Design a protein around this ligand. Structure first.
Ligand SMILES: OC[C@H]1NC[C@H](O)[C@@H](O)[C@@H]1O
Ligand SMILES: OC[C@H]1NC[C@H](O)[C@@H](O)[C@@H]1O
Ligand SMILES: OC[C@H]1NC[C@H](O)[C@@H](O)[C@@H]1O
Lengths: 659, 659, 659
């Protein structure tokens, strides 16, 4: 189970199973241990009041692939199959199951969130017989209890050449805020005259189904596909007609064309890859990380990943600095156009940030701690982060400047970067307070160490304000505009203090408290405010043991790894690399939970972190302050013979590292 | 009945009557055979789910002019009047009825969709008595069954000088998507003290009425008017108050001011005119075509005509390439500012085109086959054109470039033309596939010949892609912007094939099939990809026979006419000119149906086609690729002594043609 | 009661009491005569159909400060309190009440609409007992009858450090157009362990309450605060969560930080001030005028004041030319950034003005007589002003040009001023009619003298059209853009006529009618079309006695004052100054009603007028047509020893005047 491209599980154990996800940046499908079922489906961009937090949330959607298969009128179940296996092919996001039913037939089924068609899904089923048998196949559209006011439809779309049977449902999110349409069809190879008649049943309030029978002789392979389109009022004005239209189009494209297009898109994604020689487990793990990031983003959009991407409802689907600081930097280097989507998400919500600033008594743009559809604040009111954790504004500005540094796109800087950088700088200029010594303080925040609440002069926050102001001033110079000279004066005098031992103080109330996650250490990377090697080391020595083993998110150890790599300490770098995700894994596919021993995968934030430890740490790759990508000194784990990183920067460079 | 300015009908035959329309680009009113009634009223820009196609539709609206007239308490009906006549004055869009009631009085009534006031209507009624008589007059607001949740209101708006009685109705389209308000008033000449008291009855769930009596002595003329305002939530935030406000405004402007303004606007429209000497029927017919286009469009808006304009619900009020290719070119030459509205419709829906492209796996902007309020696809799901007829994107780009060529407005090119041209070119670049010989193919479309479904390399479609790409590249050069060099490379290598007989092949599966309408012939005009005269001729010879007499729309013969005019073949040109619309006519006003012997007027697309045959064909007028309007060789029908075309181009030129 | 900074009232008389307002540009709170109650609360930007006019309106909001106080379970009443006093401190918008309960304790309470936090309020309560006693305190959230579908909530927001109890209500405006959320908390000094337990009762459908008891020992002061946040769907997508979030944030900021920020903002506002020596009553009155303007506007927004600011539902909260011509000029001179908000209100509604123009048959932008949320017309239909009072378009243009003149901001001219000026000029170009002598007329308007309805060539209206056209042409020149030369030709020939006595004729039907308010006199100031002193004087002589004593708004005499000051006639200037507001005052705080002896304060329009009489009249300050602020000859009232005006223009100049 250490193929570098495939994750595999034998005989799923439902008592200890955490599904894997396939996704195209719009729809995500999470596996079930049960054959021919899926656990959960999630549509990006669709939010309503639901469960956790009393704020907007992703909504569990139609489990549109659910099928029941019977042989000779005997239902297939986990309990009467054998040789049952599941595999995820990360090369093309194909989830496949396979099993034997008694003495009758082998079943293989593969499903896909099609890469080119954001709202279309497909499952292909093959049955290979060892004896004569008749299958009954049923596709179920059960309206989840998250949705309401459902309607269940069925019709035949025909011409002289086809009969396309459409199983359609339409329903609402809990407050009526979004309308959801799903439309499914079966695709056969045998043509209109010979295809099975499709029956429709509507026996339940919350479920309807289409079904058919097929006699198959011994020694034959019978194939069929299920295509499904899932779309909402958040994506299109008339989701009902659009879903039908999409499934009909996909049906007439046909399995072969769909999968060819799908594969082309995935092949382009994997032109940026990380290859490790001498450690199969590392190789597979890093592939899983890349795969989940690629699955949970989409080029040419305004979508941004939640901390859990499309793996579920984790953190209500909300967007945090988890994007800008954690998932964005690796995507910027490998695929700038994915990064472009992430920052586009922020650019389009600049106006709601302006609104937030005004409501909280400030100038410019104040980005929310948690963001969703509108760009307004979405943090649950019970968390003081919503009101008080303000570094997110600086995080957005850092991302925006980085995007420009890497691409050199001055047109985008003028159209999008500068709006962001200017407004966010204006925020910080209004956020600081000058004291009697002419220093600038940022008081009463929640720190990046979120256990420290309502404290003053948080190191990380104050670091982001410095960068935000500096970068906005540089941006002005690039565009030939005059920037308020206050921005520089403030930046140069924002307080970052040291304790008597010379260690960066986390905040004004800080002595030796345990901390939730990296904060002061973030001034070294990614901010690069602290570049002195002895200072990096002292901060590392002092804080690295301040993060407890339990209930601490995967937003720490990856940075420790990167910083030890930069210091050229292989044993330390490798210790922290492994510690950042290996204690967080869930079976059977080594998905990453938020915390050690956690059970809430997939935490895509953690993946993005570790990916920087690999690319920026072991690879030595770094965003040069004067533009483009550079390489600094680095070390590999002892047991790594070669590290190869492809498709870096706009020149798409390959970096090879050996001992 | 061959006045060059008036269409007239004696004694309307209700068993065989197709009403004429008066319209101001916003409201259309379709005549009834019955006196003092109207058949149908349609409001542009208002769409909701309704009947045909399960998709958005124009909605039958309040027949706000319906009046009942009684003499000595005896209702006027078709059955008790005599000398009944109707006439449409195309000079000012006045529909007039006139009749005699027994021995008592002559009635004349004229109604108008006021040209300056998009939401206001007026009917003027004159009664000339031959004996003493008392009239009872009633104005009815019946809520059509297309609307729901109606409220019926009545009030008196007063000051010391006036009493303006308002009959008001407010209701909803089927799904609640639009709120509709209608407000009517009666205008008298005799002033507040002497005017009839107005009674209000609300006897039915779906109808209320205002009424009055008036004694008139023998030998006197008594005049009154009905003013009506009709508006929706699609046009204004508060339609209820806005309708009342408008009717009060119009009332205090008075009949005389309203008609003077109305006539000024119509006079401006007719400064661009076509005059034919030697054929009264041609003259009247071409006037009707101009009149319908002028009535169904409006300068300084973002409105675009449906194929049936405001003549009714035809094609659900949706916008098709019927605008860009068929109705737009004649309007661009005669009145550029009307063309500007047509393309503005598309510019404002550029975003919904981008959305469609992404949903179907493409870059840039993919315009919908059928468009309505949002700009999203509105083609009924049962018709495969929705998903597969793709030339519409190129049609929109061609229109946009043409607009620039004719006006020379480089500011508009930068602000509106280039956005369109760039996105649409990006679509085609993503739509083509390169083959092993370095040619580019466009596979799996429905052709302009819509009877050819799911075929490859449609001549017309491939023609539009070439033009779209070339024009986008030229546009880039004009604005000094760098365009992807791919656009030219692709354009130059898109496939256009010939069969062994040297005739342009319609598509890759094409041999000798009957075709719905012109396709390959369109490469000659309007695309002008084929300029070789022998090639034009061969394509004409081959395909002209391929269109059946039945169920083929009026989007063919007009092109045949134009192309024979260009070749200087008068007899052929004239045969096809007449064949394009004369077999499609409906009595008593010679309105045009979509197909030969059809019964679904008024097909404004057909009119636009024929108008190009006249202007571009017989007139020889042509949009020069380097800018402005030029004239190429042409011929007139034998029986036409003179053809005069006025107000052409931004220089407003007159073209005179004789044998 | 003539402190120059405080308005004060002893023993409020509920039978003759008009409350004063505290406001921050977003929320207004109007005082009650009763202790620890407020009369009315109004939220800017929230409109729905409600009562007057059948059109959108501000809505009575939660009286969120209402408290009941008891000693030893004996409620505070008028009948058992003594030295009851109220005071408004204009320095910081603090409304304070103070009183004695029997012989046992002194209570003071001060409330604030916090200047930095647009949606937050605070009341601070101090109780000093002279014997041991127990207070019961109750904060009531009664849902006003203006709102519907209310929900009453209560919860505890905690961490180890705090327990923040939230009393929250959510409700809807009459039609469901706006959702309103209010969330209150109590702030204690004594910390989490020792703070009173908070009880919650929900005994009524429309009222719930939080309460607590506290023992206070003899000779001790017990202090607590109430913080309230009031917000709607018009301000934020999720008002319910945002209100809770804001109150939590304010609570953790704490009273002291909030009042510090509050005071900083007020201190900046008062850096522009008017000081009079030798007339305490004048000084206090002019301070009240300034105070009300500062309270009813807000820098860095798109908010514009209604004629009654945030003092209540006066004129349904609608925006009129009352802003551009009456409130805007004094704010432009003193604080340009407040003026910038006023014109931003119009810039953001330019599109709805374009819509209105098209609906009424005109080009460009036609601003509504009455404006609210959308920018569409909101005048009640029963007032002919809505359809016919057209000078508002010119008024908006004049304001826009003035803004540029004073600031010199050419970036804003290009981005915002020119759009407005161009569209509005295009309106007038389409609005005029040329007659036989080559003059231009504007026919069928309601005049600025609104008693003149449906008349032609109103002096004021025609004056605004001249200015609008001239300013748009000048604006074009500044930006190097070509303007239609028709604008100048029209401007130069618009009709302004004189009667035989050489007096400016108000309109074409005008001889000697009484008039509602200044019209022809407005051509002298503000338009400055009439600069000849003898002409000014003759117009003044003829019209000044044409305004009746009764039911004439305060939009006349202040102009008379300014014009007599410009003529150097102190006795006349001073007569008209006092006449403009002194007969309009209401007790106990000298609030200004709309008309003499009126009872509908606070008419902020009137205040703006008088403030121009002071600044532009007595101060001689004037907007120079070539840019910046200048000073012309002027006179002071005899009894004024010195007039000092501070913070004028972008150079923030001080003007000092003596005899
Ligand atoms: O994953 C989202 C969120 N969880 C809590 C963490 O402390 C914070 O750093 C992160 O943004
Ligand atoms: O007129 C609407 C529509 N009808 C069908 C025709 O074939 C097509 O060309 C046209 O666009
Ligand atoms: O104060 C609002 C409105 N009331 C009536 C006045 O006549 C008018 O001039 C003013 O704009």
């Amino acid at each position: 189970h250490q193929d570098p491209w495939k994750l595999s599980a034998d005989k799923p154990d439902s008592n200890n199973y955490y599904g894997e996800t396939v996704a195209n940046g719009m729809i995500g499908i999470i596996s079930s241990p049960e054959p021919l079922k899926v656990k959960e489906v999630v549509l990006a961009g669709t939010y309503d009041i639901y469960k956790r937090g009393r704020v907007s949330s992703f909504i569990p959607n139609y489990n549109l692939l659910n099928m029941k298969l019977a042989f000779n009128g005997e239902s297939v179940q986990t309990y009467n199959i054998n040789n049952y296996k599941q595999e995820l092919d990360m090369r093309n996001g194909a989830f496949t199951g396979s099993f034997q039913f008694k003495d009758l037939a082998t079943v293989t089924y593969s499903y896909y969130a099609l890469r080119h068609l954001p709202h279309c899904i497909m499952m292909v089923v093959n049955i290979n017989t060892q004896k004569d048998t008749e299958i009954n196949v049923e596709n179920l559209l059960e309206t989840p209890s998250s949705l309401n006011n459902q309607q269940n439809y069925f019709q035949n779309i025909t011409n002289t050449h086809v009969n396309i049977p459409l199983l359609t449902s339409v329903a609402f999110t809990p407050t009526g805020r979004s309308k959801i349409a799903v439309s499914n069809t079966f695709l056969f190879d045998e043509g209109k005259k010979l295809q099975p008649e499709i029956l429709h049943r509507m026996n339940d309030a919350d479920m309807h189904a289409m079904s058919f029978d097929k006699k198959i002789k011994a020694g034959k392979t019978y194939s069929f596909a299920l295509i499904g389109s899932l779309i909402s009022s958040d994506h299109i004005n008339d989701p009902y007609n659009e879903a039908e239209r999409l499934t009909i189009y996909a049906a007439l494209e046909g399995k072969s064309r769909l999968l060819n297009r799908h594969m082309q898109e995935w092949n382009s994604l994997w032109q940026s890859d990380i290859q490790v020689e001498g450690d199969p487990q590392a190789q597979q793990d890093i592939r899983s990380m890349l795969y989940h990031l690629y699955s949970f983003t989409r080029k040419s959009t305004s979508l941004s990943p939640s901390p859990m991407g499309l793996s579920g409802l984790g953190y209500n689907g909300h967007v945090f600095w988890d994007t800008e600081i954690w998932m964005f930097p690796p995507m910027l280097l490998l695929h700038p156009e994915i990064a472009k989507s992430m920052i586009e998400y922020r650019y389009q919500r600049l106006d709601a940030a302006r609104k937030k600033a005004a409501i909280y008594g400030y100038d410019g743009a104040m980005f929310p701690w948690e963001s969703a559809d509108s760009g307004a604040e979405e943090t649950p009111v019970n968390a003081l982060t919503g009101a008080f954790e303000h570094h997110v504004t600086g995080d957005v500005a850092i991302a925006a400047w980085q995007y420009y540094l890497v691409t050199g796109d001055k047109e985008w800087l003028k159209e999008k970067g500068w709006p962001i950088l200017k407004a966010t700088a204006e925020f910080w200029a209004s956020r600081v307070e000058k004291n009697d010594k002419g220093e600038y303080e940022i008081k009463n925040v929640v720190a990046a160490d979120e256990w420290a609440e309502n404290i003053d002069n948080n190191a990380y926050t104050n670091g982001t304000a410095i960068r935000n102001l500096q970068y906005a001033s540089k941006c002005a110079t690039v565009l030939g505009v005059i920037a308020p000279k206050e921005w520089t004066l403030i930046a140069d005098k924002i307080l970052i203090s040291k304790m008597s031992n010379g260690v960066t103080r986390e905040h004004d109330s800080y002595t030796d408290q345990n901390i939730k996650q990296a904060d002061a250490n973030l001034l070294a990377y990614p901010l690069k405010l602290i570049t002195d090697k002895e200072q990096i080391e002292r901060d590392l020595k002092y804080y690295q043991t301040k993060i407890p083993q339990s209930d601490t998110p995967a937003m720490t150890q990856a940075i420790f790894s990167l910083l030890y790599s930069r210091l050229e300490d292989s044993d330390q770098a490798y210790h922290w690399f492994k510690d950042a995700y290996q204690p967080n894994l869930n079976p059977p596919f080594r998905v990453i939970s938020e915390c050690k021993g956690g059970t809430n995968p997939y935490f895509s934030t953690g993946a993005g972190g570790v990916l920087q430890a690999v690319i920026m740490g072991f690879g030595g790759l770094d965003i040069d302050a004067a533009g483009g990508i550079k390489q600094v000194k680095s070390v590999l784990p002892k047991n790594w013979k070669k590290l190869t990183i492809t498709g870096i920067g706009i020149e798409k460079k390959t970096f090879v590292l050996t001992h």
